[PDB]
Design a protein around this ligand. Sequence first.
Ligand SMILES: CCCCCCCCCCCCCCCCCC(=O)OC[C@H](COP(=O)([O-])OCC(O)COP(=O)([O-])OC[C@@H](COC(=O)CCCCCCCCCCCCCCCCC)OC(=O)CCCCCCCCCCCCCCCCC)OC(=O)CCCCCCCCCCCCCCCCC
Ligand SMILES: CCCCCCCCCCCCCCCCC[C@@H](O)O[C@H](CO[C@H](O)CCCCCCCCCCCCCCC)COP(=O)(O)OCC[N+](C)(C)C
Ligand SMILES: CCCCCCCCCCCCCCCCC[C@@H](O)O[C@H](CO[C@H](O)CCCCCCCCCCCCCCC)COP(=O)(O)OCC[N+](C)(C)C
Ligand SMILES: CCCCCCCC/C=C/CCCCCCCC(=O)OC[C@H](COP(=O)(O)OCCN)OC(=O)CCCCCCC/C=C/CCCCCCCC
Ligand SMILES: CCCCCCCC/C=C\CCCCCCCC(=O)O[C@H](COC(=O)CCCCCCC/C=C/CCCCCCCC)COP(=O)(O)OCCN
Lengths: 606, 56, 52, 178, 459, 175, 52
Amino acid sequence: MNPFASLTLTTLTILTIPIMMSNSNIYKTNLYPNYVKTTVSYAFTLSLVPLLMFMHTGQEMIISNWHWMTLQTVELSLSFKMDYFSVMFIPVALFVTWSIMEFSMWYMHSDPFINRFFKYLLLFLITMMILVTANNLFQLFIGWEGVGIMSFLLIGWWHGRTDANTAALQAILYNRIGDIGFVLSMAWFLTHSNAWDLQQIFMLNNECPNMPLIGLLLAAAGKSAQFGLHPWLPSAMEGPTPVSALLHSSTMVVAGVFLLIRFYPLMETNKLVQTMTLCLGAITTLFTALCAITQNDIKKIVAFSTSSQLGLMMVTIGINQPHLAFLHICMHAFFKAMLFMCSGSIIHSLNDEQDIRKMGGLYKAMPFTTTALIIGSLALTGMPYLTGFYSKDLIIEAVNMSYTNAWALLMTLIATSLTAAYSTRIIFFAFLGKPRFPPLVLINENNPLLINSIKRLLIGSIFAGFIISNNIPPMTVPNTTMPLYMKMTALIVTIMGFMLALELNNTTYYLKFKYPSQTYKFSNMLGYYPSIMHRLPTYHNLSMSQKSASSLLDLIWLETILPKTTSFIQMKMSIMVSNQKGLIKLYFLSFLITIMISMTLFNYHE
Amino acid sequence: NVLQIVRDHWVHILVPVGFVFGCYLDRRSDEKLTAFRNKSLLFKRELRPNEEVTWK
Amino acid sequence: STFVAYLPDYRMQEWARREAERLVKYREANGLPLMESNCFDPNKIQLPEDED
Amino acid sequence: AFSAPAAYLTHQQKVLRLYKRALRHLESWCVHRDKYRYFACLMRARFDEHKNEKDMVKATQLLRQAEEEFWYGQHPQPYIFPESPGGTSYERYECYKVPEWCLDDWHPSEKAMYPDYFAKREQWKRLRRESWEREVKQLQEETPPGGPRTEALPPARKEGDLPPLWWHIVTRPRERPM
Amino acid sequence: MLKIIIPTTMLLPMTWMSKHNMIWINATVHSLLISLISLSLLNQLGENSLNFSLTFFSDSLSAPLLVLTTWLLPLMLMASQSHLSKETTTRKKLYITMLILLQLFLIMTFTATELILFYILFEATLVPTLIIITRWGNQTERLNAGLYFLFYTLAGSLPLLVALVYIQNTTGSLNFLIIHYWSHPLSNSWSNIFMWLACIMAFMVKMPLYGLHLWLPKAHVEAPIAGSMVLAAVLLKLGGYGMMRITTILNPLTNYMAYPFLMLSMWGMIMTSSICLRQTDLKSLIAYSSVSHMALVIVAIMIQTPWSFMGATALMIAHGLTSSMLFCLANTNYERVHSRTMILARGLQTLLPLMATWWLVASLTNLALPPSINLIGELFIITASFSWSNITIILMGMNMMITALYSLYMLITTQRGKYTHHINNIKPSFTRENALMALHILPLLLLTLNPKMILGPLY
Amino acid sequence: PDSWDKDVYPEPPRRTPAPAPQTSLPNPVTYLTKIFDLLVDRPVTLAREFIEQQHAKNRYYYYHREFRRVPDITECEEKDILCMFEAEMQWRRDYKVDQEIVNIIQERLKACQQREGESYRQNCAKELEQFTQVSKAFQDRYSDLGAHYSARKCLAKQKQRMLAERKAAKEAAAA
Amino acid sequence: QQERDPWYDWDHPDLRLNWGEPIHWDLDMYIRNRVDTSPTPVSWNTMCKHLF
Ligand SMILES: CCCCCCCCCCCCCCCCCC(=O)OC[C@H](COP(=O)([O-])OCC(O)COP(=O)([O-])OC[C@@H](COC(=O)CCCCCCCCCCCCCCCCC)OC(=O)CCCCCCCCCCCCCCCCC)OC(=O)CCCCCCCCCCCCCCCCC
Ligand SMILES: CCCCCCCCCCCCCCCCC[C@@H](O)O[C@H](CO[C@H](O)CCCCCCCCCCCCCCC)COP(=O)(O)OCC[N+](C)(C)C
Ligand SMILES: CCCCCCCCCCCCCCCCC[C@@H](O)O[C@H](CO[C@H](O)CCCCCCCCCCCCCCC)COP(=O)(O)OCC[N+](C)(C)C
Ligand SMILES: CCCCCCCC/C=C/CCCCCCCC(=O)OC[C@H](COP(=O)(O)OCCN)OC(=O)CCCCCCC/C=C/CCCCCCCC
Ligand SMILES: CCCCCCCC/C=C\CCCCCCCC(=O)O[C@H](COC(=O)CCCCCCC/C=C/CCCCCCCC)COP(=O)(O)OCCN
């Protein structure tokens, strides 16, 4: 038999072995995290081979190994899609997870539940693999909800903290808002195409109507945290740094983009949904980039960077470039995970401090972390021939040369400026200048786990772009002829962002004080979206849930109508009937009245 | 030695005996509905040389 | 759970699949349609003679 | 956190609290140490400008104007210590805090391990049981008939007395219990 | 079918002849054996039902309900024996007798071939439940709860009796097979409209339908743990089973007679899900969640599609198991702290980790996480409603969001945060409680591997 | 293999190209394939050979059940319960068989879409039209019957469709 | 409950409540896992204009 299918299924299967051993003795020892990390590394090196087979011959497969149930004409089977997307995304996710678990072995060393933490990470990885490799909509929904629930459990890791529970519930709420659209898409596809599997849907939907595509777009916006449902991703930073590095940076938050990529044959047959996706992506990326440049918490800045990059993935989907979006996902994973890893090392060195205002000169105190963060920032800003170049600059080129909304193009360019802006902010406030942290210096990055993991992701962020770009078939028609000024638009924008952000950052050394402008207040408080949307609708919903639904209806009026009215009427009638004085005079008078009636109203009618 | 344990644990036979009696009564109830045995147009069959009924 | 998993196929799904395979093979081996829009034979149906 | 609050804050206490809040928010605005020091000395000078005011009405009006200025010019994202009520590590270790009475429900096999610790715990329990009645009697003695007026508690005053209501203050789990 | 009924009857003299210290052991062992025997009814023929005799038959709809009842009895016995330890031997035997009589009436109700026998047993289920609630309930409101539970049911059930005898007079039979094979359309007339209402309202109030649901919070909160288990798991499903049996003769009238009930069910599932967000009592939240799930089941039954009936059957089974597990979880904490207020005991995950795991799994099944059977039923019903009308998806999605919201709200309130300081009587979880939670949860997950066992006849 | 009929489940002749190397660099996929063969495919084949050897010593058979053709619901009088019951059972069996036929056609369509790759829109037109025909027939037969369906309701639906078609044909004859 | 003093020695620290004190009618709405009424640096009805 072809080894392709066996290897692809074994890669997914061996990841569940530590979950089965979670009840064994190894889970009670301190060797469990290393065991899980080694298992994930073996899974990565095994998944490398089907990638080579695809890169050689373009081998793609679907495996309907197990039949689950059949409802009339519809068959539901455990089916795996092993096309280019799966065989490319699985090794990248496994590589990032391997690095992040090796990092977690050091970062979470003093946590008394490190074994549970590694088990939760492995469960998230398994659910994400299920989401990615699913061939029908039910399995993809299983992966969807699995990663959602694992995110809920990992955000509220410190369950004694109120804010962590609040953030976890917020993430669940937004994901279910998107899940409404997911369920709508599933129902429409079953009702009109009689299938949930990808192959039948493609065949039967030559001209896809608006309803399923709008449902899928709502689901993607919920999962990828677009402007309507964005705020949960920045608030997900309540979890430990490895959780933010793995789930909410590079692997899970791309699920909506991946869902839209999975349905690109249907998406390219509709222009209204493409326009909606493009506009939503543009507003999301620019709003999040604008919010990022004023934040003082490093994790918040990097989370807003992730949201802006997700918006960029949405805009490159909107211009009908899905393969470019997938390439951007794969490229961005590396350096975004590295950026969170560097931020976590900085936080651990400075006694769990995350505010950049208390981060002084670490350019010399933390040389390796500084080098890694600088390389990641250059990759994020699209420096040529790095990992970010081969995808982001092609995305800008394709956006420039398409029949696209002008406002979306302008907002994409401004977001490209703001990207360099907040990258310069991070570097300037975290690594340059004089120390601003407490005097007792605990800075120490001399641990082989941290160095090895950051080194692996650094080599990735340096060479993966070139290697992957040169080792895949051409799936997009290149833009070969464009004006020179329009070819250099991305670089001009990036240099302008660098220069102006650096100038405004250099001006804070001056011994001059001014009160903030209203635009600064709008940017720092996230456009007041969490200030209003987290207070007004929630208050009104809970107030109506108590005052109207619970009290006014169930406790008062539904009680009044059926049971209380019956009780009152029967009590009144019983009092009327039974309250007789016991005098035979009245009784026999009533008897005479009754006799007179029976002889007249009844005895005359026959 | 078995007298006292029987006297204190004889209650553990009531339910199995009830089960056996229920199966026996189910067979008796089946015995009263043999009006169409080997008479349906779909399952009417020629008896084997030694068998007496198609089902019991 | 073992008993339920190994319950005999009294629901006639494997039988239905085999019957469908036989019918499909017979029907496309002769160029006949795979299914008729009429479930019952029109020749045994006696509609009312006049509709107006 | 440790001190019993008073019925109200004096003008002096409000003035010092406003001074500290203004200094902290100015430090939030002035990231660098030298610029913060310069503007903090300027704030101290402006604050000492009205140090020796005798008219309470004008001092109160100055305090109100200063509070309005602080509210208009406060930092929307002031620096917060990680363990502070607004910090990123405020209640991080609350899930690791287990009350000491849970140790009584341990299995005898669990208490076979750690024998000296449980012997000393028995000593502590005898101490608490032998001090409780004296604590109650002292609290009854030192209390006005119309109930306590503040949340302050008296110390021990006899030879072998312990301060009343001490068990749940002394036996805090920890700040980093695991 | 006698092989199930007769051992259930034998359970009575067996528990009345047992020693004072062996009643729980004997009853649990033989109830588990009876459940094992009843598990053999899942072998269904497909085309038609299993007709054992003139009196009883088994269907693909009846068999999962029968197995659920037989499996629920031992869990009820395990949950009951903790709070009944101080009781006398005679009263404990009477309680077990009530449980056995309820099981017998339930197993006979789901298999009757004729509608008058079904009605007789379906009313006979009232007496043991009423006795349990009003005798072994804890608070003083149990009397009012029992009165509500009795009279809400009877006010709907008596017109059903009148309609059934009238229908037998007009048609000549009420045997379900003859009823189905000789079905004729119901014309558009006032007499037929009132016949439809008399055939429907009893099962409506047993679900319960929103607006007729006020008895359920009272009865489910004020009953002992076993009473709440049987009320939520099984007794709510009598209305759904009756609807599936009775709507065969109601066509084509249901086409427009179902509009007010569909409107009430959708808006009331929204209302009860919202109500769950502001609840100070832990049992009332579970009761209202049951109301919402049964409203969804009512919609599924009303729309009259094969996918709708399949989803309704799956949702009935899944809701029964999940609601029983949630009630047991609440009862454990109530036994610890002797109060039903949700915010009294907080941060129980720090003190009881395995019980916190049980809480998490129950909350996940309550919000219908894939690929659990709860979401199987809910998704099938939602798809059928979408086929009925594309605008139903708004209400379905709103209900899903609110359900996740209050489920995780209950989980966070009861398990997370910091423990209450003054409460110091929270002992480690007993083997009995953990075993009860495991016996609730494991069949739920095992049913995922074989979903066709609970999808019903339309499969 | 030969286990399933190749007419019910057909596939193209499976044309595959021959390797034409262009560089002296060794191909890692070929070496990995040889390693996979020698380490996995041979032990699995030997285990299967032993399993088949054990299976051959115990050979028994199971048969496909054949059902006679009984009169349908059209030739049953109004109150004949036995003929009605047998016709209804036959109709339900036919309904299941038709569902399985539609399932087979859907499997063909899915296999074609996966196999044809980038040219599925052109090379799967025959499967698409087959599915369209079977779907129209199955819809006309069984759609809108609802729950509590029966052979009588299917007959009523067919008769209504026949009446509509006859009226349309008669009115077209006068045109 | 978010507006209450976090430095006070509450009987219930997370809840920020004291034993025996009257409890607000809408406590479960204000548990600080939920609706917050704390004063904002920018006035309400000013943030609304900017957002809209
Ligand atoms: C030939 C083509 C090539 C083009 C090249 C360039 C073209 C021209 C570029 C010029 C454009 C922007 C230039 C910089 C802006 C700010 C500079 C400045 O003056 O600083 C002082 C001041 C900053 O506040 P502050 O009091 O000094 O800060 C307090 C402390 O310093 C707090 O200190 P801190 O420690 O907290 O941190 C300080 C931090 C925080 O600093 C801030 O507070 C700034 C935050 C906001 C300003 C950022 C600019 C981004 C604007 C995007 C808006 C898009 C449209 C949105 C529409 C909104 C509608 C309401 O600063 C930073 O770290 C980085 C900030 C941004 C740096 C990078 C900005 C460059 C990107 C924008 C230009 C794009 C260049 C390429 C063009 C691409 C396409 C051609 O800025 C202002 O007061 C006004 C800012 C202007 C924003 C206008 C928004 C545009 C739309 C307005 C509405 C239009 C409709 C009309 C109304 C509606 C009618 C119905
Ligand atoms: C705590 C520590 C946890 C860590 C340890 C975990 C160890 C691993 C856990 C993961 C195991 C995954 C198992 C995956 C399934 C493998 C087996 C599966 O394929 O069998 C299923 C079998 O499932 C069962 O059939 C269904 C379960 C039946 C449940 C009945 C429960 C008993 C009744 C209890 C009371 C119920 C009350 C409510 C009832 C309504 C499906 O059968 P099917 O693929 O078709 O069979 C094909 C071949 N056949 C047909 C010839 C057999
Ligand atoms: C809190 C929850 C409680 C349970 C809720 C139960 C819901 C019961 C409602 C029943 C649904 C509808 C009942 C009958 C269907 C149509 C009713 C009527 O309004 O329709 C028109 C009927 O016309 C007039 O409206 C007549 C009805 C007017 C008198 C009824 C009083 C309604 C006022 C509301 C009182 C509240 C009732 C519930 C009390 C609790 C249709 O016009 P027409 O085609 O010509 O008549 C069709 C009947 N034919 C064929 C026999 C001729
Ligand atoms: C389409 C159907 C759904 C549409 C949305 C309808 C409105 C939803 C109403 C939900 C009410 C639920 C209330 C119950 C939650 C309990 C209380 C609560 O959650 O507290 C709020 C909690 C705490 O606030 P923080 O600021 O994070 O606190 C941190 C510091 N203390 O935060 C939250 O979770 C509030 C979330 C409210 C979301 C409501 C706004 C959503 C609006 C979405 C519209 C945009 C649609 C997207 C368009 C996409 C393009 C196609
Ligand atoms: C606890 C709350 C539950 C409340 C449920 C109550 C609603 C029950 C439904 C109506 C009950 C009466 C139905 C009567 C039994 C039906 C039998 C039947 O169909 O006979 C009709 C008789 O129809 C009637 O007589 C019905 C008249 C109504 C009598 C009592 C009215 C009380 C109020 C009725 C409306 C409320 C019902 C729904 C409300 C639900 C709860 C709010 C026709 O017979 P013939 O005379 O032979 O006509 C054909 C030949 N000429």
